[PDB]
Amino acid sequence: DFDGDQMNLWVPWSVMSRVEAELLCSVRNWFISTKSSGPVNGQVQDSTVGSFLLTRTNTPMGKNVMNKLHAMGLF
């Protein structure tokens, strides 16, 4: 989390390490948890509720719709 955590970062310089880093140790391989066999990542907090608010049917104002300009702005 971002409460004061510090994490190490080193940039490979060797060609063998650089080839290895992008092909084998890229984070795309850790999307599925080896421990649980399920996904690791997803929406957290601001987006889990944001996905619900975006996709819910009725807002307190009315139906959950937006005009073209604001639908474009989502992208």
Task: By CB under 8 A, name the binding residues for other proteins.
Answer: 14-17
Site for Mg ion in 3-32 (CB under 5 A): 3, 5
Smallest gap, in angstroms, from Cβ of residue 9 to other proteins? 20
Output the six-digit token pair for 50: 């944001």
Name the phi and psi angles at 2, rounded to 5: -105, 40
The closest of 22, 74, 38, 27 to 53, measured between CA atoms, is 74
Closest to Mg ion by CB, 5 vs 46, is 5
> CA-CA distance, 56 to 45, in Å (whole number)?
17
Of the candidate residues 1, 27, 62, 75, the single one contacting Mg ion (CB under 5 A): 1
Question: What is the binding site for Mg ion (CB under 5 A)?
Answer: 1, 3, 5
